[PDB]
């Protein structure tokens, strides 16, 4: 399976967000949507909330052309898992997206940026088309944590074709950084694209997923316990 860390489309720039959705996600998506900016979201199943409790955010995200991909169910250190454990960690997110959205993801980003040959083999066997890394880090999960002003200033020098790592579980990323950096990036000539579009893969959201069935209605299986 191919590993990607840099866009190829001239002028493109990928704002990417890990570990969500979360309690500020509706705000984040409204900010992106108001600027016609597209985000890439690498979601968990049970980590900072249960994915089924975020179904409405996920549906808005899906239907507005944002890119949704897997970050594993439980945010595991994948280099420590067996083939079978990793397959389960991916299957569980696939199943949630099948229930909520009717589709399976074709892409994923490994927690901690940690992967190996077992990870790549599981991805190949499960039909994934790509493992998505990054090439610039906002620092929003560094500890001690930089200020929003520091993060915004770092964004002023991230060049074209950046795939930027952010975490939507950080309130200041949603409330301070992204509202400041969208105009910085758009006004200097960058196109805020999803990762597949910026890689010269398809710009059609339907090509980022495999349709399995019609989206489900919420029932008692929409649970993480
Ligand atoms: O899982 C992660 N981000 O979503 C991660 C964690 C540590 C370092 C780099 C990335
Ligand atoms: Zn993560």
Author numbering: 41 to 265
Please quote the authors directly.
Phytopathogenic fungi secrete chitin deacetylase (CDA) to escape the host’s immunological defense during infection. Five crystal structures of two representative and phylogenetically distant phytopathogenic fungal CDAs, VdPDA1 from Verticillium dahliae and Pst_13661 from Puccinia striiformis f. sp. tritici, were obtained in ligand-free and inhibitor-bound forms. These structures suggested that both CDAs have an identical substrate-binding pocket and an Asp-His-His triad for coordinating a transition metal ion. Our findings revealed that phytopathogenic fungal CDAs share common structural features, and provided BHA as a lead compound for the design of CDA inhibitors aimed at attenuating crop fungal diseases.
Xu et al. reported that the wheat leaf-infecting pathogen Puccinia striiformis f. sp. tritici secretes a CDA (Pst_13661) during the early stages of infection. As the crystal structures revealed that Zn2+ was coordinated by the Asp-His-His triad, we considered metal ion chelators, specifically BHA and its derivatives, as potential inhibitors of CDA. To prove that BHA functioned as a metal ion chelator of CDAs, the crystal structures of Pst_13661 in complex with BHA and compounds 2 and 3 were resolved. BHA chelates a zinc ion in bidentate mode. The hydroxamic acid moiety of BHA forms three hydrogen bond interactions with the enzyme: (i) its C = O with the NH backbone of Tyr152, (ii) its NH with the imidazole group of catalytic His207, and (iii) its OH with the carboxylic acid group of Asp58. The benzene ring moiety of BHA fits a cavity formed by the nonpolar residue Leu205 and the aromatic residues Tyr152 and Trp174. The crystal structures of Pst_13661 complexed with BHA or its derivatives suggest that BHA inhibits the activity of Pst_13661 by binding to the zinc ion. We obtained benzohydroxamic acid (BHA), a lead compound, by structure-guided screening, which showed high activity against diseases in cotton, wheat, and soybean caused by V. dahliae and four other top 10 fungal plant pathogens for molecular plant pathology, namely P. striiformis f. sp. tritici, F. oxysporum, Fusarium graminearum, and Rhizoctonia solani.
